[PDB]
Amino acid sequence: MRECISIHVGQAGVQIGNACWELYCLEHGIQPDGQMPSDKTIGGGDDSFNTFFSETGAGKHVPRAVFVDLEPTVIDEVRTGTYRQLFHPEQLITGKEDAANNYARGHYTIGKEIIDLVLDRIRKLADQCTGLQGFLVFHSFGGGTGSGFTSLLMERLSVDYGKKSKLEFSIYPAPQVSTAVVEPYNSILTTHTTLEHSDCAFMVDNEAIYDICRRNLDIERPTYTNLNRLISQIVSSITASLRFDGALNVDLTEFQTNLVPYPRIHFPLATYAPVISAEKAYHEQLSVAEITNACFEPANQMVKCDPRHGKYMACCLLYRGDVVPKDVNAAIATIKTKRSIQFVDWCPTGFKVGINYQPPTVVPGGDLAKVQRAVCMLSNTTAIAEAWARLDHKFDLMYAKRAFVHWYVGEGMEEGEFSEAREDMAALEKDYEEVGVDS
Amino acid sequence: MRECISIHVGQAGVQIGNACWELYCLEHGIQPDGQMPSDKTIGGGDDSFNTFFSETGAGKHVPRAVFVDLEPTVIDEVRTGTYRQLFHPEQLITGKEDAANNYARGHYTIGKEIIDLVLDRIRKLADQCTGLQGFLVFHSFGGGTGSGFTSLLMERLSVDYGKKSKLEFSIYPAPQVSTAVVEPYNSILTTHTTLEHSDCAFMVDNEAIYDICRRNLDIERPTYTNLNRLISQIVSSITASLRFDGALNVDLTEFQTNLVPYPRIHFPLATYAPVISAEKAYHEQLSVAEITNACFEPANQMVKCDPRHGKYMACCLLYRGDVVPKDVNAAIATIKTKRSIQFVDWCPTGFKVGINYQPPTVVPGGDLAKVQRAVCMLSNTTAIAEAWARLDHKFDLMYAKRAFVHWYVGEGMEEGEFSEAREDMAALEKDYEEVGVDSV
Amino acid sequence: REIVHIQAGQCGNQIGAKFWEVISDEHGIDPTGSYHGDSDLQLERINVYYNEATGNKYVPRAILVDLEPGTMDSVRSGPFGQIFRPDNFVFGQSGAGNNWAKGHYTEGAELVDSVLDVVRKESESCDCLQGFQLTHSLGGGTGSGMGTLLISKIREEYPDRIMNTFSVMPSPKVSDTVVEPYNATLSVHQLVENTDETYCIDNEALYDICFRTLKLTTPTYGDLNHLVSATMSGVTTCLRFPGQLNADLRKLAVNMVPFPRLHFFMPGFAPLTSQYRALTVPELTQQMFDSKNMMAACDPRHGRYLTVAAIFRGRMSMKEVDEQMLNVQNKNSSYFVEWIPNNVKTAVCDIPPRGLKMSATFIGNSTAIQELFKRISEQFTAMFRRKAFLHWYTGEGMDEMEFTEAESNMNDLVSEYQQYQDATA
Amino acid sequence: REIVHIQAGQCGNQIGAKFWEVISDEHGIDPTGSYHGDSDLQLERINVYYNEATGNKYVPRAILVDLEPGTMDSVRSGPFGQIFRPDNFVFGQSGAGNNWAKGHYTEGAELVDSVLDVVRKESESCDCLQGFQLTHSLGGGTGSGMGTLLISKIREEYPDRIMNTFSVMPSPKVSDTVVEPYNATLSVHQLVENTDETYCIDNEALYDICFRTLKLTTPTYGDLNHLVSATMSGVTTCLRFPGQLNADLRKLAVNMVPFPRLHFFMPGFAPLTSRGSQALTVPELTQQMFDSKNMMAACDPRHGRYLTVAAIFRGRMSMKEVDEQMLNVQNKNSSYFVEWIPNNVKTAVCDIPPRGLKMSATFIGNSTAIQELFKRISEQFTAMFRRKAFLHWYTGEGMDEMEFTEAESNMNDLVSEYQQYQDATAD
Ligand SMILES: Nc1nc2c(ncn2[C@@H]2O[C@H](COP(=O)(O)OP(=O)(O)OP(=O)(O)O)[C@@H](O)[C@H]2O)c(=O)[nH]1
Ligand SMILES: Nc1nc2c(ncn2[C@@H]2O[C@H](COP(=O)(O)OP(=O)(O)OP(=O)(O)O)[C@@H](O)[C@H]2O)c(=O)[nH]1
Ligand SMILES: Nc1nc2c(ncn2[C@@H]2O[C@H](COP(=O)(O)OP(=O)(O)O)[C@@H](O)[C@H]2O)c(=O)[nH]1
Ligand SMILES: Nc1nc2c(ncn2[C@@H]2O[C@H](COP(=O)(O)OP(=O)(O)O)[C@@H](O)[C@H]2O)c(=O)[nH]1
Ligand SMILES: [Ca+2]
Ligand SMILES: [Ca+2]
Ligand SMILES: [Mg+2]
Ligand SMILES: [Mg+2]
Ligand SMILES: [Mg+2]
């Protein structure tokens, strides 16, 4: 058995972390007071859910999680929420002043005076681990804390916990819900300073989650609660292999082995189906062939891009529910001849299929409906480089005039770090070009 | 706080001070014995009228004023007049021999025997102030005391009170009621001496006031009593900003910043309207537009000059009575087009407006009719330099022959003091020429 | 969290008292300081401006400063006069005489330490102080001379806090003295160096709105201040109510200040009041970007928008404000710089101002603001070319070198705005 | 402030006695000294010429002086002889014999110490002393010689005070002796140096007014003195009544004396009619006042130019009429006023008129035409000095001959100085 520690940084990481841990309890039958009636080994055990939950002497199941934010307003939501008794007061770390959407403020100024406290609370959970395998870090790209402080945490985690895996759940910046104009800068900065301290990163564009909530779920103006409940469904089905018995992606090393052939290209695209509204009383039931076909529709991807004009390097189909393997490869046979699937020539054109018989769970009162089968598609395609191209262009427009740079320089960062980070993205954008594009 | 001490020097300063303080008491409701029944705060207070009146424990309201003359006959009229109980005996200072229309005797021979006594009485009044604002000095230019002693007093006041503001209410001489032939001499001498000791001086041309009383009031031969009752109305309008309060009331020092662009150019031109008799004021309502239009008529100014032949550097309208800002803005816009008001290019072409709501009052038995609204215009125009030219020409005519100069030399002055004063007058005329010239 | 408010001078105290009386009514605070509102959103961020006195009383974190006791006793005698702490009234007796030199170097120097003692006493009792906000005029003496002196002194002791000011520009249409361009040019020289955010409230624009739009032939200062309080309430809504666009002063500065010296904001309000017909969201957005609603006498079409913060108050559909704002960006796409992507941000608050069902407040950093400083510079040069009225300042120890240095800094600011008005991408 | 009045010699005491009669009648003072008047204006400035003794007895501040006791025993016998202070009489016995040197150098020198003691006595009782006025003649010996001696002595002890004189020019038409031109020249030389104001009362002009105008074939000293009394009552109105124009002797000197040596005024009086003629207007007074017939000095003002002029009107009249008529006569006679002294004509109006007149007008002019008066005296002087006539009268008292030429050369300069400014122009 090998334990995983989750770290939630910034407002986006905390609020998404709140939605995920609520979902984990609903799936495993864990009550808000930490009790788990279905668990027969009181105060210990080596079950699959023990990779994410630790048990006290009183049978209380505690999430192996750490919440960090430089302002206490977002953490107080967890401290007085529905699952307030689930966490210990030491798992929640609040600052007094946030990073003001400034990467330099969260990395150099506020991060310097809080990095040792966060690592101390992390080491206290690691000492409770018999075989810690790695960490999962939840953070945003545009926030000052989510980008600035996260970058420093991964740099330190590589030192204190070498040889351990580190997985990212990132929030790509979208203007419909953005709160700062400097998010493009902060995004490029954290990406360059973490590229060598992350083994796999699941990027979620708020633009895609926003439109999925509007089209598929009939929310006129989606809020963070709507976005986070949909995002936690994707995070749940990605981490379900760690929390349930199985053979595909049983440990964090297998994620990088199955999905990451080249280390710098560790941004796999996620596609989820079906997304049905609860108010839809009429309840059609899509076959495995229908939901697998929807995994190749751009409208269901976590990042809006066109995989038809890219190349695949790895592909993982994660089914959840009433799914038999006979129906899966039958759909893969039909999808071969109906879609534009082009793998790189140094990889096998194939699919790694994982089936979990337990169907997905929906939060009572949410916007998502109960389904009998669902698919989460993790594919490493070069088409995701479009997100890097859009981000680099917005960076180039602002940095050409040195706009807003004085906020970063006045915080201790030197201007040379900007072009150093931009040069890394130019190299990353060309790494995708060499793997995918031909003559 | 913001108390003002008034100094009245010589016959003209004393007799004008008598008219002003009689008018002040009528405006505030102060009886000739110093009692003010409307005043609820006995022995003191920080009311608006307290800038000019102190209070005793007995409820008497005493003017913050000093009357000084080198001869007693003019002040003796105040000691036995209607308002004799208003002043303390220490506020009225008299000598035994006047300056005999000689600047030299006022500033030197006779003045030096009484100057310390005068400053001691001024110090006693200044000590009773919580925040002394400045001095108002009333005097004539042609008298021996009004010119010579006033110069000595202003010089001593700058030594004892630094750069504390000092305002002048001066009487420009006129041959109609002139008492000396050497008045151009004393006028040039006192102007040169006090020039750098005065922050702002309001000249009153005796010939202008004499002519206003003839045309507008139908007095066939005006006397000092007629002239002073009109002069005190201008002084009342100027100081009404300090003695009263109100939302539209603008302090005079706020006008002083607008009125004086350069230290030596501190001679505003005053204009009052309406000056009408009771026989003509009957069946005759005078609107805001009519009295504002009369301010730009050259035959209504305190000093004989033609403002059309000069350039304006500042224009302040001081309304009192039944006047609303809507009427003022309408009248100003009308005059802006029907009149040729040329401003210098180095300052905005605006009109600073202050409105008091206490209507003008008249002394019982006076020549002025009681009106519901009045206006006093303070403007800084280069046209006032004409008054300097006329005065300097009379000086040059007599000094070329050294006529009457032996009366000044015999008292201790040198001929160099005459040419030094005349040279300063010539520089002042050039200064008024330069400010009117446009920018490069 | 906490913000310390300072009002200095006649104009600063008169608009400052109007600001406290308006926002107290919005947060359910009566003149005695008791809570009497129904919504819990009123006390959520009540501590950003009010200190909680023992007994459920809310005293404002305000400091009243002046060189004469005139306006001070007038504020204490009006409504919401007893809500202010009595120990935070700091006044002298001499006055400034509309002289910038008297407020900054001569008369304000005697009282500047008494003010700093109250500033420290209020800042020491702050859990998480963000910075300071100041209300003053630039054409007078106290709020202009002593106001910029207080900013310099406070920045010395709190260098890392945010300095924010509501500065009122002088105009010949509403003029007190002739030396107003002198005091203004000297004050802005200080504002470009010692403040982080400055709201430019032009008395010229306030007059034209009262005259040409509200049809008030003779506008009073009470008529102008009614527009100022409505604008001051709108630009501080994101600081007083729950939200996450510009919730604090620093996050606001990071979003609105792309270059340090260009931190002068042009405010706009809609609708203009002094009405039973209900306004619509497309009409609020249309009037928000119109020059007729700008609080600074500038034509936005004459320049380009660097950053824009729009905020809607009332009960409306977030979808409609998204549609109308994205539609007004397409109508005026030529007036937004292309080198700053997504430079217009929108917030929506549920609590509207009193008497209005829906309102909209515009906060723009536009290069067209250079017309304001160019106007002051032309009036400054016309007098300074002939050294007119300069003896009022040299008599207080000032030098002509200080005037030419302040004028050159203004002209540099103007040409800096012009540099980005023509810069493309 | 007070004025100390001094009268010396026969003529000085005759015209000095008549002076105290008119002003006492004007101020309501009886020969005993009590105030019998009915107007407060008579006592407002009563202390200028009178002392207030116990019992409301007004005593004149007069000092009667002569070298012979004859003429002073008669002024004690005529009217107003009791009102004078008895110890203020200083009379000698030898007399002067119409000799200037006898009064100035020899006999008058032994008496000048007794006169000075009475001067200091009256000066000690003064709150603020103005100066001294002297009535005397220039033709005799005591008033001419000793009169000038009193001026120099008093000036040494009161140098900053005003010295005013009523000097009577001699005339061969009423001449007492023949040596009169010698006494006038020697005394005018003194009056040029030691006096501030001098009213030139010409006996010639006085004789012509009585003979040609008033029609008196045989004019006596009483007829000439009545014109003098009306003059000195006129030129002192501004000093005796609450005016403000030339209220004292120093303010009059500043207005009338533009150059220190040119301080000899010619006076005029209007109306001048006899008891055989029979509606006098303000324009008529103004015209007669600037006529050569009404001048109390034999000088035609149209033969010179007015440096300064003082006009005094007395009686109930329109003040507007005076201002317009005074401005009228100045425009119509613009050539006879020097243009380099602007506004050189001052006008005062007193409410009360003199005794026996409804309205009167007194003239005080400083005209360069006064040189005609000095030219006449100088011509009679040089007619005798060429022949060395009667020099033993003066050299017999130890005097020198060049002292006569000094007094002449001076007078010649006085005439030249008056001519120098008559020809001066402003351009
Ligand atoms: N999906 C999602 N995005 C969020 C959420 N909260 C914030 N974001 C996005 O994250 C970005 C801002 O990052 P935040 O997490 O608010 O910033 P932070 O880490 O708290 O940083 P500072 O407040 O500057 O210290 C914007 O693009 C927001 O739209 C959330 O709950 N869900
Ligand atoms: N308006 C006005 N002018 C006056 C008055 N009294 C005198 N004057 C003028 O002032 C000048 C004379 O000055 P005065 O004030 O009389 O003289 P003084 O200051 O007493 O000086 P001396 O008496 O010479 O010591 C002349 O031009 C007069 O016309 C008065 O009451 N009112
Ligand atoms: N909008 C507005 N402007 C004002 C107000 N009071 C004064 N002003 C302006 O401010 C300037 C004068 O400054 P003021 O505040 O009176 O001077 P201080 O008291 O010395 O600071 C002029 O431009 C006035 O028009 C007011 O209540 N509202
Ligand atoms: N007008 C006038 N002249 C007189 C009178 N008595 C003498 N004179 C003249 O004065 C001159 C003689 O002076 P006098 O009186 O003898 O002087 P005394 O020597 O001092 O006594 C002659 O010219 C006389 O005509 C007089 O009463 N009136
Ligand atoms: Ca267990
Ligand atoms: Ca009182
Ligand atoms: Mg945050
Ligand atoms: Mg006098
Ligand atoms: Mg003001």
Residue numbers in the entry:
A (entry chain A): 1 to 439
B (entry chain C): 1 to 440
C (entry chain B): 2 to 42, 45 to 277, 282 to 360, 369 to 440
D (entry chain D): 2 to 42, 45 to 281, 285 to 360, 369 to 441
Please give me the paper's original passages concerning this structure.
Due to its key role during cell division, tubulin is a classical target for anti-cancer therapeutics including drugs such as Taxol and Vince alkaloids. To demonstrate how this could be exploited for SBDD, tubulin crystals incubated with single ligands were loaded into individual reservoirs. For this part, we determined 7 crystal structures: apo structures for both TD1 and T2R-TTL, T2R-TTL complexed with four ligands known to bind to different tubulin sides, and TD1 complexed with the photochemical affinity switch SBTubA4. Here, we used the T2R-TTL crystal system where there are two possible colchicine binding pockets available since the crystal system is formed of two copies of tubulin. First, following practices in cryo-crystallography, we calculated the standard omit (Fo-Fc) maps based on the apo structure and refined electron density (2Fo-Fc) maps. In site 1, positive difference density, sufficient for observing the bound ligand, was present at a contour level of 3.0 sigma when comparing 1000 randomly selected diffraction patterns against an apo tubulin data set containing 10,000 indexed patterns.
